[PDB]
Write a protein that binds this ligand. Structure first.
Ligand SMILES: [Mg+2]
Ligand SMILES: [Mg+2]
Ligand SMILES: [Mg+2]
Lengths: 453, 234, 234
């Protein structure tokens, strides 16, 4: 099995309060954390709406994870943490660790929501053909199936040989899928790190007692909190924006096939119905009544889902500490899986397929693909040797890329040249916000008129 | 007291960090300002922070970094050191003066002033005022905000004044529209029975409406109301 | 040789001064770049300039000036010192090698490389290339200039090509207009009878037309011709 001493390793990768608390402090003050405020989460950023951004979503996930950590360290210490050195202060480390990994889980995600990752993957699939001999290895899948978690790990480990110098416990916890593109395992269908981080992750696994396919136990908690935030808060945003009413959500949950005769769903429904009946007496505008009812529903649902996640984690702690763990997610082993699935279906039906969200996704895809074409015009061949990039437009677009990314690209290592160019493009695109990406796309499009034809 | 001290530390340190980040000043400029400050020449905390930052900058310059990148690295290290020192000083001051704080007859103004980091915080505030708060961009933003806020308050007062005092001067299409543009909760609180004077209720409604607005929302509402106010203004 | 050396000195020193003035780099950045330069280490002229500038900067730092003002004063003093040193080195090199310069078999390629200020000039050129010539503003200016120049050259070649060889593809209203927009003196020289080949004459007409234009005039003519070329383009 795995010991908590290695899993809570407070040693930092760079050779030489608490260290783990310092990890959260460093993550909060990082510039990309502030940049997260300008990246869309699901819905477009209006001038009046309080819809979640990447920063607000990350803070909410961090708060949920910190609450889970408080419950684990202050109430279920004997049931969860057995054979832990007295040097480790669980009450200070576990909540801080969970909060830090919750706040950082979406640092490297591209802008324009999920469509950002989708557009990056489609562009890389088209412009890095799998049949072409230049791109045949599974390593280029790192870009054909581009994932935000790998970019987040790259940012925290190789962006400032070390970046934020996070502790080994934190870095182990941020590895959502403990596998690479080259490694094929049925346990995880996504890669969790790039090829360029293969040496880093192998180091982390060495200092935490983890291995390929073995996931840090707190990663399950972070993923469960992420899913809970996604579902509940996207439903709340849908209600707030007026795309649906509180009664619509209640009917959807009640009419859901799985949420029927489900204890958690029924409990939440009855509590929300009683509170809504009480609220209806007060003379409020329909928007105000919907907001109050949705706030109470959010409180009840978040409490129930968090309690179910805690119970599932406590019951399955022995399996989580075993190297042969077959658990795919914490929610599915909890009593709140049906409610979470129903909430996700409601969000997909009413929020994700709304015309505003579809328009935002289409605009983001257009902007991302156009900017990637214009940047590839100045990136391709810089490392292989071919000099098609040496044009005034190519030199300008190379100079517009962030200096740190260019410095990492120009470093000498064992990465293949095509991989280095693709990673430079991915780092450039992923680190941009929505407004900055749009502005750069417009600038380059204005300046590309002559060279286009 | 602890919250106010943390607020002051955040202001003084991260405002300087933003000043360096935007290019309004350099890390060496901040170091020179702190060293040349009258009260920081002999201050132990300031001297320790300056010495540590000099030692770190002696190593950060070896690596090939852009001037902006080197400035950002040194600024981040200075932020870490200064925040650590100021927080430690604030904690020590709070622990030493806990009996005074727990007493009703407490005359302590702020936790920073009674701490050992007051000189460094004062120097940082002076640097922020001299380099950041009087920059062209900040002054232009303040002027634009003042113009927008005062114009919007005028147009809203056109529809708010007299609602509670019994007058009828608000009962115009523009007044009705601007009243309807106010958030419903503020209006609901405004239409309540209490001992507050009617003029006080109107002023509080205006203050609640203005305070809860964001920059973009305030600007958009001001522009729309200005567009719609053309006939009644003339 | 003297003119080329003066051109190089002006290029390096004054481009560094412009970089400092525009805010792309600081005076301390230039001092560190020169000090950390491999060749400028243990170089008499570079060390002399560095020490003089460091003393003057230390003296200047006492006066309460804005960071931009301090940078400007330090860069002005550095410009004075560096220009004086480089000019003196160039004079000494020219005087020492005057006999070789007066010989028909002179192998000297430039005056700077034979002087004691070659290392400082090379370091200044590298600094200008790293911080000034590769700045985003300069890159954008170069890209815009390349686009404008190439487009205008295409549109002018549409009306120039074949005028001297005999082929009459140029005899179109657009071709006649763009030929008429060329300066009359250049056209007169082009129409003169000499021994130059016809293709050479047409290319020289285009080169004379493009070279004699200023930036704003070239942009205006490019926009005019692009507006008038819409029908004939397709
Ligand atoms: Mg998330
Ligand atoms: Mg504050
Ligand atoms: Mg010249």
């Amino acid at each position: 099995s795995m010991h908590w001493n290695d899993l809570l390793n407070s040693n930092r990768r760079k050779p030489k309060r608490q260290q783990i608390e310092r990890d959260y402090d460093r993550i909060l003050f990082a510039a990309p954390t502030r940049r997260l405020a300008d990246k869309t989460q699901v819905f477009p950023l209006d001038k009046n709406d309080s819809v979640r951004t990447r920063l607000t979503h990350s803070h909410e996930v961090a708060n949920l994870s910190r609450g889970i950590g408080m419950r684990l360290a202050f109430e279920l210490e004997d049931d969860v943490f057995k054979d832990v050195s007295e040097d480790i202060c669980l009450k200070r480390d576990v909540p801080a660790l969970l909060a830090a990994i919750g706040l950082v889980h979406d640092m490297g995600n591209p802008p324009f929501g999920h469509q950002g990752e989708k557009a990056m993957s489609e562009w890389f699939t088209k412009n890095l053909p799998e049949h072409s001999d230049n791109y045949k290895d599974k390593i280029y899948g790192d870009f054909r199936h581009f994932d935000g978690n790998s970019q987040t790990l790259r940012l925290v480990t190789k962006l400032q040989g070390y970046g934020l110098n996070l502790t080994y416990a934190t870095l182990a916890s941020m590895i959502k899928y403990p596998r690479s593109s080259e490694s094929d395992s049925s346990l995880w269908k996504k890669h969790g790190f790039f090829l360029s981080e293969k040496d880093v992750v192998q180091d982390i696994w060495n200092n935490t007692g983890l291995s390929e396919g073995v996931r840090h136990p707190f990663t399950y908690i972070m993923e469960a909190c992420d899913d809970i935030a996604y579902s509940v808060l996207d439903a709340e945003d849908i209600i707030k924006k007026g795309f649906a009413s509180f009664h619509d959500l209640i009917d959807f949950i009640q009419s859901n096939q799985f949420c029927k005769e489900d204890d958690v769903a029924k409990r939440v429904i009855e509590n929300c119905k009683k509170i809504h009946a009480d609220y209806a007496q007060q003379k409020l505008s329909p928007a105000e009544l919907n907001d109050m009812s949705m706030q109470m529903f959010r409180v009840y649902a978040i409490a129930e889902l968090v309690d179910a996640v805690v119970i599932a984690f406590k019951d399955n702690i022995n399996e989580f500490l075993n190297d042969t763990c077959e658990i795919k997610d914490l929610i599915s082993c909890s009593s709140g899986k049906n409610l979470c699935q129903a909430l996700k279906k409601f969000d997909s039906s009413r929020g994700y397929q709304h015309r505003s969200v579809l328009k935002l996704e289409l605009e983001g895809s257009n902007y991302i693909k156009g900017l990637m074409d214009m940047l590839w015009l100045g990136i391709k061949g810089r490392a292989t040797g071919d000099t098609q990039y040496d044009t005034p437009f190519g030199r300008y677009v190379y100079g517009r890329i962030s200096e740190n990314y260019r410095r990492i690209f120009e470093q000498e290592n064992n990465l293949p040249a095509c991989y280095k160019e693709a990673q430079l493009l991915a780092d450039a695109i992923s680190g941009m916000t929505d407004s900055y990406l749009i502005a750069l796309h417009d600038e380059l499009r204005a300046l590309h008129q002559y060279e286009c034809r």
